[PDB]
Design a protein around this nucleic acid. Sequence first.
DNA 1: GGGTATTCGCCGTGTACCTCTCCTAGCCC
DNA 2: GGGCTAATGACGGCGAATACCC
RNA 3: CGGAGAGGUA
Lengths: 76, 1352
Amino acid sequence: ARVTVQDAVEKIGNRFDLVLVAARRARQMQVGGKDPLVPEENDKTTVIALREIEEGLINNQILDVRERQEQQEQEA
Amino acid sequence: TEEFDAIKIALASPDMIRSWSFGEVKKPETINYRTFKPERDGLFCARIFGPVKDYECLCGKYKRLKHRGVICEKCGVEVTQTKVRRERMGHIELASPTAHIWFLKSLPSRIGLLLDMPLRDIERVLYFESYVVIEGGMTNLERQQILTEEQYLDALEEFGDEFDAKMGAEAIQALLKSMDLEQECEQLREELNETNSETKRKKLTKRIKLLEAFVQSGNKPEWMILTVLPVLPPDLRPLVPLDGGRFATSDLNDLYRRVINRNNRLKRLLDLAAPDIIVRNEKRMLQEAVDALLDNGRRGRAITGSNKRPLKSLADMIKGKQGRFRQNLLGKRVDYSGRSVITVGPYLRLHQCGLPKKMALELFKPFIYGKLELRGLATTIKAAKKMVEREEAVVWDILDEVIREHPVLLNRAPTLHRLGIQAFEPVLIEGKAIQLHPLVCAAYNADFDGDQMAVHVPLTLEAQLEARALMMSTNNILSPANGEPIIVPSQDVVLGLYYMTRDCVNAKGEGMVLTGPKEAERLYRSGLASLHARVKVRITEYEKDANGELVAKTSLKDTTVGRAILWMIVPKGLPYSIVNQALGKKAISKMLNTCYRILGLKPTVIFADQIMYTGFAYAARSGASVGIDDMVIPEKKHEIISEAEAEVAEIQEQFQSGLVTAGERYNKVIDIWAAANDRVSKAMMDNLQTETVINRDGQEEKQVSFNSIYMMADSGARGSAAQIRQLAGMRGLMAKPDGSIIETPITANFREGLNVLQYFISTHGARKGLADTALKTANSGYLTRRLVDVAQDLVVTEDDCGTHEGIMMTPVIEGGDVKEPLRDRVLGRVTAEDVLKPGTADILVPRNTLLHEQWCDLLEENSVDAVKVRSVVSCDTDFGVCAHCYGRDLARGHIINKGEAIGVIAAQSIGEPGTQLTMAAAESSIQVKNKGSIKLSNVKSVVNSSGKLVITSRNTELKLIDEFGRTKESYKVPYGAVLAKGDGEQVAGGETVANWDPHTMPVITEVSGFVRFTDMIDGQTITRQTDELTGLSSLVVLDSAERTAGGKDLRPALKIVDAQGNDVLIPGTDMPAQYFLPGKAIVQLEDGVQISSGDTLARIPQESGGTKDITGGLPRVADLFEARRPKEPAILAEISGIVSFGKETKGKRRLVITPVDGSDPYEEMIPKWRQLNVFEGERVERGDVISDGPEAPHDILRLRGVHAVTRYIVNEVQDVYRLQGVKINDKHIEVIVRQMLRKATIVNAGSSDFLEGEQVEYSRVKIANRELEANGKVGATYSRDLLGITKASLATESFISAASFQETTRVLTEAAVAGKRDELRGLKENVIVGRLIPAGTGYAYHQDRMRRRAAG
DNA sequence: GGGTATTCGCCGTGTACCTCTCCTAGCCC
DNA sequence: GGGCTAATGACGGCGAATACCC
RNA sequence: CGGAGAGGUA
């Protein structure tokens, strides 16, 4: 469990678009479309998204290429 | 469309109005307000306005089941989804055009101004009173003129085939249909090329401005006359009938019904070809009904009983209180929230709050239901309801799951600063109160006295993450007002730490050596070694060095056992210089600040939580207790008292002896009792400081007192030297009714008893303070409101604008004492230039680098007087502010970024300490208190005989630039100051470098010769009396204030000529020779009296201090923010150049200032109430004082420049807040000022009129465009002007702001006719519309949308 | 001359709640 | 009945409307 | 229940 946002601040210096992107990540593993990439500790999707972005696993480029991906499959 | 900003308001075209609606209401039927059945057809129609009741048939008589979401006509109904219900709206196609009353009753009558006749003509024709020639007869008749009935006839029989004249709105329709706006614009602009008349050009420019405004709005004038009337759905307007004899206002409904009745009657009459008079009358009351519909406030407002609210009309339904009803008061109560009294939980971690189990169970019922049906434990909502109400043990696991990390938002009932609402992780607890984190309640500015906190649950994912990243107290530990932690240990934990870290001189466990704090903990918790002992411990402390590595330095340290036990708390990478010495509140503030600035946030939050736990635990183990033997009564208090009564008895005996005046012995007794109070407090504190004395090995030794009351306030737990001074010693002197000090102090303590009269007197102060508290709370709320309104539309949106402009930024020093260090100010700013060393031109800092702690220290060691820094004032960013122009001083320690409306932060930071706002030297002799080089700036002085560097005027400054590279003493040199010291001369402390008469100011002559009574009439302008002691006279110049018309046309003057009988003048000095005598200027020298250089010319009595140019307190803050004239403005030199008098006292006095390269006639007005300091033939420059006294900010901006008034306002407000000790970073004042002077008046016309209030950012963009092309327009020269906070607020470019908070109909009409495409930059405006705000995460979201615009 | 310097009506109202009352009215069928 | 139906024991600001010295 | 008038608390 990690509720402090310092690592996410360092990874994303704006730390404010950080909120938006982590919120989107949480929004689409909370509802189907993607699945958690970090082991669940009975955590809410907010903090698992936060721990994802802390590890550098989720960044703006990665999330946008991933999302454009799920579209080109959903039209296909 | 998507949730956007930059919304466009314009006048609607009839075709697209018809496009909005679907069908027209046939007959109007309305509820009777005693029968609530919606009758159809009418105002209630489920085919045009959408289904009033969805999924069922409604006609007022029909309730059949059939159309439950399917499109089909059975009696005339249409049933669809609620989305169609919202968009389905009505229209009625009027046979005749109808005007809109708002553009008629408005002071700028849009029809009147566009058609260029007074509004009387338009109201006459619209009210069906007098005809108007609609482009009718022109050969002998007039194309556009009003006609009475007989004149209209006379024209008709004169001509009927070339003449047309109608009545009402159709006439204006025909008129406005005629003009081709482009032809008018072209002809006017091309005429302006030929026209050479000033007034004619003004008129042409005004007309072309209006025409171009209508052209750019894209609105055809024919549109603004209502051809088809759109009508709301019934549910979109206020309607709430009450049963019985009492009802509610619903005038909008029957106004609709009346308008439909009138239109249907007119349609019937026109279908039957009714005669002209009857149809004209029908159109007349149809127009009247439509106008009453549009407004009744244009028809005359009135007050109705039981409701301080006018009669309902569509215009009044536009705006109620406090504005748009659903976006502010009243009253926005919201679900998923609770409210409860608060208790302390000292076990919760800093990111946690203790929340009652019942409160959680009822705050998360939907989430609990979702989980329960998710686990299969419930099959329906009913089963979930039963499952939760039965309070079974299973729901506890469910609630633990839904609360595992779901945070909650706690807000104090008044939120006076940003921290007033903070997130926490809820821990489910037994009880019925919210267990708030003890260390956060100080930030909440709350207490534990029955006051109730409020919880809310951000319940969507994205709100939760907004809470976690921003709202939680962990991420918000520094005050957003001045930086610096706001999470400082306040009263209990600080007591525990101060106890545990104290030392003694002898206790069990003294002197030994222990293996790290390991053995310190082991030995103390054995009770074998006392917590306090001079002990050598081999500690291994970690230091951050190199690129961020940790070096473990192990050394033997002389400390105390408790201090090592505490050192266990501090994480690695911190020095041991912090956890030694008795830790006070300021010491723990320093420790947390250093931890934040050296390790970061996570070590800081862990350190704070652990130090809270340890402070509480060791406060408990201390048993620090307050009794009555602990408070110590000084043994000699009564002796000092009795001495005081003896002294006052002698003084009063002299009083009855007639030896001292009333004020004399009053002040004597007051001073005696103040001295007695000081002596008593000193004795009490001396008793406290070493009340415990302990032997070491036989000899007694002082040491920090074990006395619990001494720790009780010395730690800064709670209280002060004043308070523990007034418990054991006397609280003494205090004020009486009328707010004056009583002769006899409150000579009794609280440990000793209080006499009845003493307590009675003391009650006055308490009552006064409580009333003051209530009034200040109300006024602080109001001030926060106005400041937020003026500052809210201000968001950092750009990172760097490259503006090398900035402000001089200096350590503020008054007199000999440096009030604030430049070290404090410089922190968190960005330099506007590259600073050098005080000895060499070497570059110390790079281009516009952030000046954080390291660079601030580097500037401290290389001591510097001033730095130019990037300011939001100097910022050239438009619709926003450069980040580097701002700095980063926030709850963060990194450079600020885009978003984050720092205007609101500034407003709440200025309003937060508002509650704390409460309601040998200068003018005698300047005594420099430190040794350093003497420096004089802006001298008005000529070196005369006896080495006299006699400085005149108040524009001269005495700095003390010492041998370090910056100043340490600052003084203001008064008029006629005599100085025997030169520049760069080392001076002893308190030595009179400048000396003059304290209680009167002389006019020291810098030249010698004959004295001429110039511009005088003996016995008319001066008093006639000569008392000769050395060739002197007792002639006194009459007061500056207004006098007779034969004594105010010549101003008395003493012309001083040389020793040759010839006139002489000295350029560059505000003392040409002729001292023009102000009021009460006793003339010392007669005509022809010979004097030396350094002799007084005239004497003007002064108070030797005590001038009243400042009032202080929150009203002072407010009137500076409103920029009000302080006891009328003190005029400055309106331009550089020679000066002279005009027509003196014609109204008031006139002063011509004659530039040598400018406009010579430049006189201004001089009220005789000002203290005049102005001569003729003297050379001045802008900013030089001409009338002495308090200067208004308006003239300061107009004359000295933008940055000058910036510094003035910043210094004034910062000094006022320092008077209460509150420290606020000045970037907030800078942004509030940049809001204040956001409007400017053009001097030399450009793309706008010659003088007008214009957004200065618009001035920048327009001038940049002007140099972009070759053809200059014009131009353009401008001067910024300071509007008041309210005036600047109502000056907002976005009309959405004004719609909710000022008069509305005129503002809305201006927006419509001008077609104002407001950027919707405003935040509360985005609240008003109902969309995301452009700040923080919302700004980032809209930025992402814009990035996705034209990228899809 | 002309800016004060008065007079002449309207209107706004920290925060939250606990209780209470009081709410367009005139009127011809 | 009922269905229509067109100030004084607050306080302060503020524009409009006067009041007055040289 | 929409907004005003009143007591009490904080």
